[PDB]
Amino acid sequence: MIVPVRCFSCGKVVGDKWESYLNLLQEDELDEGTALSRLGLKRYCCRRMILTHVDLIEKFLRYNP
Amino acid sequence: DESAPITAEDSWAVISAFFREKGLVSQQLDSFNQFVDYTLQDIICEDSTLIEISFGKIYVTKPMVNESDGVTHALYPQEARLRNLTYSSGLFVDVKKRTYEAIDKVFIGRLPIMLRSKNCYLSEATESDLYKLKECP
Amino acid sequence: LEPGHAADQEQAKLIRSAIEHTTLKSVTIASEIYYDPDPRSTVIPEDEEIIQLHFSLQQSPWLLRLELDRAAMNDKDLTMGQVGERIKQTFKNDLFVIWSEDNDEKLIIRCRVVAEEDHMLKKIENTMLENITLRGVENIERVVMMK
Amino acid sequence: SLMSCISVGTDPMPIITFLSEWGMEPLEDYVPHQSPDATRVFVNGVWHGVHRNPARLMETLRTLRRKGDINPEVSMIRDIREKELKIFTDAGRVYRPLFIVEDDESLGHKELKVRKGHIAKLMATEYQDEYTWSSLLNEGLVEYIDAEEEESILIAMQPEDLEPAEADVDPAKRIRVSHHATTFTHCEIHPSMILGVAASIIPFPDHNQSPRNTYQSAMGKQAMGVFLTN
Amino acid sequence: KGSRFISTLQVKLYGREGSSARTIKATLPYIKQDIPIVIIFRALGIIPDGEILEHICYDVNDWQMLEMLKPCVEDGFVIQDRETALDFIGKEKRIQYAKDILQKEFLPHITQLEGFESRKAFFLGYMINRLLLCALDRKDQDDRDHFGKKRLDLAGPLLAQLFKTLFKKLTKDIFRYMQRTVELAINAKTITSGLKYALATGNWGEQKKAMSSRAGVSQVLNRYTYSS
Amino acid sequence: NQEDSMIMNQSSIDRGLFRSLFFRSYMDQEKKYGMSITETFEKPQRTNT
Amino acid sequence: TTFRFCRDCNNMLYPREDKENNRLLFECRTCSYVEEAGSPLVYRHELITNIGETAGVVQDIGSDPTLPRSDRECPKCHSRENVFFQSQQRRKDTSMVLFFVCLSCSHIFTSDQKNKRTQ
Amino acid sequence: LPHFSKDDYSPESKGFVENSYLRGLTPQEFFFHAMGGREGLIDTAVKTAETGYIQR
Amino acid sequence: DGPTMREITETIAEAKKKVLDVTKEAQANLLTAKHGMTLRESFEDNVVRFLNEARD
DNA sequence: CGATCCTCTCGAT
RNA sequence: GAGAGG
Ligand SMILES: [Zn+2]
Ligand SMILES: [Zn+2]
Ligand SMILES: [Zn+2]
Secondary structure, three states: OOOOOOOOOOOOOOOOOHHHHHHHHHOOOOOHHHHHHHOOOOOHHHHHHHHOOOOOHHHHOOOOO | OOOOEOOOOOHHHHHHHHHHOOOOOHHHHHHHHHHHHHHHHHHHOOOOOOOOEEEEEEEEOOOEEEOOOOOEEEOOHHHHHHHOOOOEEEEEEEEEEOOOOOOOOEEEEEEEOOOOOOOOHHHHOOHHHHHHOOOOO | OOOOOOOOHHHHHHHHHHHOOEEOOOOEEEEEEEEOOOOOOOOOOOOHHHHHOOOOOOOOOEEEEEEEOHHHHHHOOOOHHHHHHHHHHHHOOOEEEEEOOOOOOOEEEEEEEOOOOHHHHHHHHHHHHHOOEEEOOOOOOOOOOOO | OOOOEEOOOOOOHHHHHHHHHOOOEEHHHOOHHHOOOOEEEEEOOEEEEEEOOHHHHHHHHHHHHHHOOOOOOOEEEEEOOOOEEEEEOOOOOEEEEEEEEEEEOEEEEEEEOOEHHHHHHHHHHHHOOOOOHHHHHHOOOEEEEEHHHHOOOOEEOOOHHHOOOOOOOOOOOOOOOOOOOOOOOEEOOOHHHHOOOHHHHOOOHHHOOHHHHHHHHHHOOOOOOOOOOO | OOOOOOOOOOEEEOOOOOOOOOOEEEOOOOOOOOEEHHHHHHHOOOOOHHHHHHOOOOOOOOHHHHHHHHHHHHHHOOOOOHHHHHHHOOOOHHHHHHHHHHHHOOOOOOOOOOOOOHHHHHHHHHHHHHHHHHHOOOOOOOOOOOHHHOOOOOHHHHHHHHHHHHHHHHHHHHHHHHHHOOOOOOOOHHHHHHHHHHHHOOOOOOOOOOOHHHOOOOOOOOOOOOOO | OOOOOOOOOHHHHHOOOOOOOOOOOOOOOOOOOOOOOOOOOOOOOOOOO | OOOOEOOOOOOEOEEEEOOOOOOEEEEOOOOOOEEEOOOOOOEEOOOOOOOOOOOOOOHHHHHOOOOOOOOOOOOOOOOOOEEEEEOOOOOOOOOOOEEEEEOOOOOEEEOOOOOOOOO | OOOOOOOOOOOOOOOOOOOOOOOOOOHHHHHHHHHHHHHHHHHHHHHHHHHHHHHO | OHHHHHHHHHHHHHHHHHHHHHHHHHOOOOOOOOOOOOHHHHHHHHHHHHHHHHHO
16 A cells, blocks of 8 residues: 655655666666665665555555446 | 475475465365265255155355345355345255155255355456455455 | 481381381282192292291192282381281181291292182282281371481 | 365275275174284274285375375374274364475485475476476375374474484574484475464564463454455 | 264273272163173174183283183173073063164164174274273373364364254155145245354354354454454 | 553654554444334434434 | 183183192083193282283384384394384383384393393 | 374473574474463463452 | 583583483483382483573 | 453344 | 453
8 A cells, every 4th residue: 555655764755766666676677675775765764664565556456446 | 406305495385386276274165165065965865855755966056146126146245245145055956756656956045155165256266357346366 | 206316317217117008019019829739739839948948936729829029028118027927917817828038039928718719819819909008007108208 | 273274074985995905804704813913904983804914005005195096185094013004084184284205216215205306397387377286296295194194104394404414513503403213204394384374473483482472373363454455 | 974873882991900800891872781791792692702802802812901801701601692691781672672772872883784793892892902901001091182083173064064954854844745735835944044043143053052052153254454 | 661661753653653544334224024114214303203 | 820711612711629639620611621720820910010011013013113213233133223112011100111122033122231031 | 293203201302492592492392382381371361260269 | 602602502411411321221220219209200300300400 | 059350342132 | 142452
């Protein structure tokens, strides 16, 4: 269920980084740790935000209504 | 080599094979499917016959709804859950009206169906069909 | 123990055997019924030496023969003479008891009844094992020495 | 537990017929003093007859269950010392799968029947999401065991770490005893399978005082998430 | 399969450890007293002591066990044939009643049919053997906590109980309707609501509740998290 | 945070940490029986009520 | 004890003394059969029992995968292939003693240093 | 356990946890600890309803 | 410490040998039971002490 | 005739 | 009645 805007712990904006992260993983065929670092997600509080996120919205958008 | 012994990591391939085949609720499904496929016919053929009304083959329809001032149609679990209906199939048996002569088909009722069992719509449903039926894959 | 006298490890062992309930069942390996018709001539070759004695300082051809455990007899403060004289002071005249010495390799007690005899002996053996107090106090099953 | 199943029920009648056909004196014709070393044969608590060479009968019975000729959920227990063969086809028996261990090249000298080749086929089928769980079962590489049969078998806990050979250590690593028994018939698929749904969520429960794992098992059911996508 | 008559047979060893003359008596359904084992064997057609003891003791050199059974042989001495053995149990009409119990009530698994006696006598002897093995301190008391000896009943077996019950009621309702036709009307609602009631409530005993079948079979299904 | 209490960060709560939706369904039907007697779903006023 | 049956009846033979010749005879009470006793031992109790210690020693014993295997040498053949167990006598006051079965002989040997044995 | 041979009175065989919670417990050790653990929860559950009745 | 662990490891192996020696002794019929208790009870009591000693 | 306390929620008659 | 909380 959709990328949180901002890291809970520090407040760093993370909601603009999801699509770029998926691309870094798929298109550039990079590993999660270097993908996170390329996004400028240096601290572990910001890293858990994205790496740990589960995008259920995709599943939800599948329901026909 | 193909004949080389398996290591400890290799156990998860086997564990994935199991589950990919069984899932996590196999006991539930296996028991019910056995009841429908074998047990049901056996109960019907026990003391059955009378003084002469015999009971032949039993049939289990897919789950349907008998609508008050309406026709009978396919009942899917999401419609059952929302409309407070019982997701059940109709039981129909072959009844012979044998009449003595020298010595000397029929609706039985509705059997509640276990979700994701053989008689349940969802058992053969694809991922796209589940979302279409408002059911979680 | 007695106020003296309570440091005496020996006096404790003595009071233990004096109070711990000991029956015949607790000392016996096996009991047997043989047909030894001649009272002064054994059919059992082991017993020969016992019959040589027990004549100085009528019966039954049926022998009730008990074998006792050397270790159990030593765990309890028992001697054959004690076990024997205790069997003797039960049936008194209606049973005849002979026994092997305390040094004598295998511990044996030989009994005889002083028509319809065969059953009576099997009945006596029951009373012998189950209903005879060798030493000790009734209800006191196990006694342990503790410092 | 994660991999345990319950027996559904099978008609015992074909087994009974097979037993009378593959040896087995009927009870009516049994005379003990002239068959002193005979195994008593029980099918669902019913003593049907006796058998002289239960070793051959037992080899036949197991081979068939491994081919699928006898239903994999049927349990056959041989008590060598008690001179008894017990077979159960009835429902309600909680069973679990185990890898089969067998002699290879030299009579000694056991090896799991599953080899890397089988694992490759399993994973080929995984990537196309051909070789399924039923393939392992029908080829007799894996097999179902209930508590009654568990009594007659010797299970290794790990494939490698329980059966390669003997001829330094990590101080950090936990202490593991050894082979100390090498007459294995079976091997655990994976010991973590002794656990059920809730406890399977706990990280490192092997590093926790046991009641804490029981406590977590309760609370995991009180934790909100996304119960269903719909 | 086919009904579910649960008769429990008890083979009891009378006399305490240390009490001479320890007898073995068995319990039969619908039979007042306990029958001394030798009398059961004779009622089954196994007459000679040697044959009766062969059916119990499976090794000739086990004098220990044969000495255990000597008081039984003595307890049965007065009965020396099948007719009198059946007679002892439970006129004439009583002999039949006794024969009937042995086929119908005694060991209903095995078989409930006529000619099987040898099967039942061997099994009866297997139970005595098992009893003596423990009584002789060669075997441990049976562990009533062993999972192998326990069966877990699921949806299938549970519905099969109800569907048997409800289908017999339907069968009974039809016979009554047929009886009234002294000069098509099948109550479908019977099954439909019967099955619904049991699954709707915990009550797994057909609107009665009297039996602890109510226990909590069928619960409203946990949906807090996916794991629950 | 003693005897099993805990200190949670308000700022991270403001950003959504451990925030949850809660749903509750309320049910009703028009009667159980009555050939002519039927309950009605409506906004009730006076009518002696 | 070791008991006999009527050659014809298959019923237990009950004892009977001669008295005149002082001899033990076994008589059948279903008919007129009478044989002499082979031994005077008419009864045996046994409270400290050795019987059933070694029980379950079947030729197929070695094929039991659950039975442990020692490094012991069989005193008879000198085979180091054996299976072992503690007393099968399921009694509280039983000895911790081990019984080995040579998987090549069928020979039963014990770990016991005190007692001998005759089996 | 069916991973042991018959008549095995060794520490590991009868429930001796050699390892520490830090090192981690083996499956055999894990099961045996769970067995010991359960006896505690069972009597906790009893030594509450029983003591409550005493107290009354 | 690495050294403490080594010492702990050896503390347990010596306890493991005490239990073996006592076992081997029990199996040889050399172990005599004290008045009031079984040979097997005596053994179990010894094994548990060695094992508790080791943990302590 | 006994079989902890108190607290909650749910469904069904 | 069941499920739960300390
Ligand atoms: Zn951050
Ligand atoms: Zn005769
Ligand atoms: Zn040898």
